[PDB]
Structures are given as C-alpha cells and as structure tokens.
Design a protein around this ligand. Structure first.
Ligand SMILES: O=C(Nc1nnn[nH]1)c1cc(-c2ccccc2)n(-c2ccccc2)n1
Ligand SMILES: [Zn+2]
Ligand SMILES: [Zn+2]
Length: 229
C-alpha cells in the first residue's frame, strides 16, 4: 500500500497512522531510506521524525495537507542525527512546535542540527516526564537507554499495536547495526530490550531503516548488540 508523493513514500499502518519514508544517496553506497511516523489524533496531526532534508520535510507537510488537511500540532524527533532532525527548519517555518530529548537539543549544534524548540526530560524508569510533553495525545515517549546514540528515544502509539524504535531497532533479518560511530556498545543490548519491555503489547515494530516487522526485530537487534560487548 505504498503511496508515492514526489520523492517520498507514505504507507498506512493503521486507520490513523502512516509511515513516512525519505531517501539520501551518496557515492559508493546505495540510497538509504529513513522512516518516521504521522499520526492523526482526532482533529490534529502529530509527526515523529523529520526527513533527511528541509525540502523533503516540507513535502511531508504537503502530503499531510492534501490527504489529511488538519493542523500539525507538534513533532517529536528521536535523536540528533540528519535522518531524524535534518528537516527541523521546515517544521519551524510551518509553525509546528517541536520536541526532542534534552540531550538531543544539547547535541544538536555540534551535530549540525537545528535544535527542537522544547526539551523532553525522562524519569529514571525511562518514561518521559509528562510535564515536559504537553498535549502529546497518544504518543508515549520512552528513553530506553543509550544504544545507537546516547540520546535515542522511542515512541509508542496508544490505541494501536505500533511501537517505533527509530534507529535503535533493526529488522529481524538485518545483517548489521548500521552506523555505530556514536553508539554505546556496552548498553545497546539492554536498551534494545528495554524498548521491547516498555511496549510489550506492540506487535508492529516500526524503525528507521527497514519496513515494519514483528517483535523479532527487537530480539534480533538485541542479540546482535550482545556481540558488541
Ligand atoms: O544515520 C545514518 N545511518 C544509520 N542510522 N542508524 N544506524 N545507521 C546515515 C546513513 C547515511 C548514508 C546515506 C546514504 C548512503 C550511505 C549512508 N548517512 C549520511 C548522511 C549524510 C551524508 C552521508 C551519509 N547517515
Ligand atoms: Zn543516528
Ligand atoms: Zn538512522
């Protein structure tokens, strides 16, 4: 059910949830898909992650205008790397309130990202402090611990079977953990497992660089991360 819209792809995952996909291409390597989410929550829309670029992110908003035609109340971005935060300026130009882990906003300038406008903080159990995530509706934001990066966060969608691992989680047949240049090799495995335990009823696991998968994505990612120690 892939819907092509310019250079982006949208796939409906639930009556009110879509995966957005955008592409970046470099020499010597194939084009890399990056996935985020779009959620219709009643009379408003919520976005998880930008596309790689401002232009692509503006196209996400154009697709939302054409197919949903409701205001985008907020966006949450899941770590301070280009695939998740490269299009922040497009969100801000559109007047959308933006949220990220406080640590992502701390890292953003050095990483070459524009910071989100608002910082999330997290309790010791990993769940976002609700006072820092006003009006998040069905988005349930969880910091699983350091893994792909020190700041990576994850998001479940209440009322659905969906949980989003961002770049932390790879699919059940993945042959690598991707870019580990910023990774926490000691804690990756526990963080992957903590994500699974935070959303134990989610049967559809969505992630940055593979199509949606079963919970075997979580077990397989953790088993690969076991070898990093
Ligand atoms: O973030 C990444 N990867 C990941 N995420 N989670 N685990 N690994 C990731 C990937 C890539 C990439 C994009 C196209 C071809 C090859 C590589 N660039 C990238 C971005 C800008 C310039 C050069 C590379 N960044
Ligand atoms: Zn990353
Ligand atoms: Zn990534």
């Amino acid at each position: 059910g892939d819907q092509r819209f310019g250079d982006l792809v949208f796939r409906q995952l639930a009556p009110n949830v879509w995966q957005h996909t955008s592409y970046l291409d470099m020499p010597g390597f194939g084009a890399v898909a990056s996935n985020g989410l779009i959620v219709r929550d009643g009379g408003r829309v919520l976005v998880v992650d930008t596309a790689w670029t401002d232009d692509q992110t503006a196209q996400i908003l154009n697709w939302i205008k054409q197919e949903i035609n409701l205001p985008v109340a907020l966006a949450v971005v899941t770590h301070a790397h280009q695939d998740k935060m490269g299009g922040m300026d497009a969100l801000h130009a559109a007047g959308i309130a933006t949220y990220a882990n406080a640590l992502s906003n701390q890292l953003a300038p050095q990483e070459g990202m524009v910071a989100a406008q608002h910082s999330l903080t997290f309790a010791a159990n990993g769940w976002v402090e609700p006072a820092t995530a006003p009006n998040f509706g069905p988005l349930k934001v969880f910091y699983p611990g350091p893994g792909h990066t020190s700041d990576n966060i994850t998001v479940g969608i209440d009322g659905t079977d969906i949980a989003f691992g961002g770049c932390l989680i790879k699919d059940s047949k993945a042959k690598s953990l991707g870019n580990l240049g910023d990774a926490d090799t000691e804690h990756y495995a526990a963080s992957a497992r903590a994500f699974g335990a935070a959303f134990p009823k989610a049967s559809m696991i969505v992630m940055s660089h593979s199509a949606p998968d079963s919970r075997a994505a979580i077990t397989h990612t953790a088993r690969m991360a076991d070898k990093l120690r």
